[PDB]
Write a protein that binds this DNA or RNA. Structure first.
Length: 131
DNA sequence: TATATATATATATATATATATATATATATATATATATATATATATATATATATATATATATATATATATATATATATATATATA
C-alpha cells in the first residue's frame, strides 16, 4: 500500500465500515474476556513495587499519578521486548522529560535508581489445542 | 349515664416500627459526565516502509489446463447434396 491518500478516502472508509466494525467488536468481547487479566497482572506488578516506595518516601496524594506516568511508560518500553542497552538511554530521557514537567531531581535520581525492579507484564491466555 | 370488647377522627406532646422530602457535611455500595495524563483490553482512520495471507488489473515472454476462430493439407466419426 501507499501512504499519500486524500481526506475523502479515509472518511469514506470509516463511514462505510460501521456495520462490520461493530459486528466485529461484538466478537471482540468474547476475545477480551480471557485476555483482560493482563490488566490484573499489570497493576499487581506495578502496585507491588510502587506502593511502598511512594508510600514511605513521602510523596503526596495527587502527584502519585505523575510518578505512575513515569513508571507506566517505562513498563510499556519493557514489555515491548526492549532490554538494557536501550533502557540506559531512555532512563535519562524520561528523567529530563519528567523533570521538565515540574518534578524535583532529588526525587528523580533515587526513583531512576529504583526502577529496575519493574519488568514485563503481558502474556498470552489463549492456547490452540486442535483436539 | 358509667364500664369491658374491637373499627377510624381529633386534643398536645415526647417514644418504639417502617415509606419518601429537606438542613450540611464527611464516608462505604453501584450507574454515567468532566479535570489532566501516562497504562492494560478490543473496534476502525492515518503517518512510512519492508513482510506473511487471499481477491482481481496491468509489464513482458515462455509453459501445463480446458472453450471456440483461422493457416494448409491428409485421415478416423456421423448428418445431407452432387458425379456416373
Amino acid at each position: 500500500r501507499r501512504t499519500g491518500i486524500t481526506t475523502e478516502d479515509a472518511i469514506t472508509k470509516y463511514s462505510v465500515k460501521a456495520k462490520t466494525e461493530q459486528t466485529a467488536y461484538k466478537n471482540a468481547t468474547k476475545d477480551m474476556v480471557v485476555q483482560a487479566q493482563n490488566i490484573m497482572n499489570f497493576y499487581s506488578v506495578v502496585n507491588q513495587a510502587l506502593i511502598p516506595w511512594l508510600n514511605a518516601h513521602g510523596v503526596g496524594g495527587n502527584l502519585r499519578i505523575l510518578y505512575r506516568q513515569l513508571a507506566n511508560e517505562y513498563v510499556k518500553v519493557l514489555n515491548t521486548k526492549q532490554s538494557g542497552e536501550v533502557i540506559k538511554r531512555l532512563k535519562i530521557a524520561l528523567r529530563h522529560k519528567y523533570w521538565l514537567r515540574g518534578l524535583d531531581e532529588a526525587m528523580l535520581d533515587e526513583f531512576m535508581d529504583y526502577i529496575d525492579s519493574l519488568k514485563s507484564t503481558t502474556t498470552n491466555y489463549i492456547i490452540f489445542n486442535m483436539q
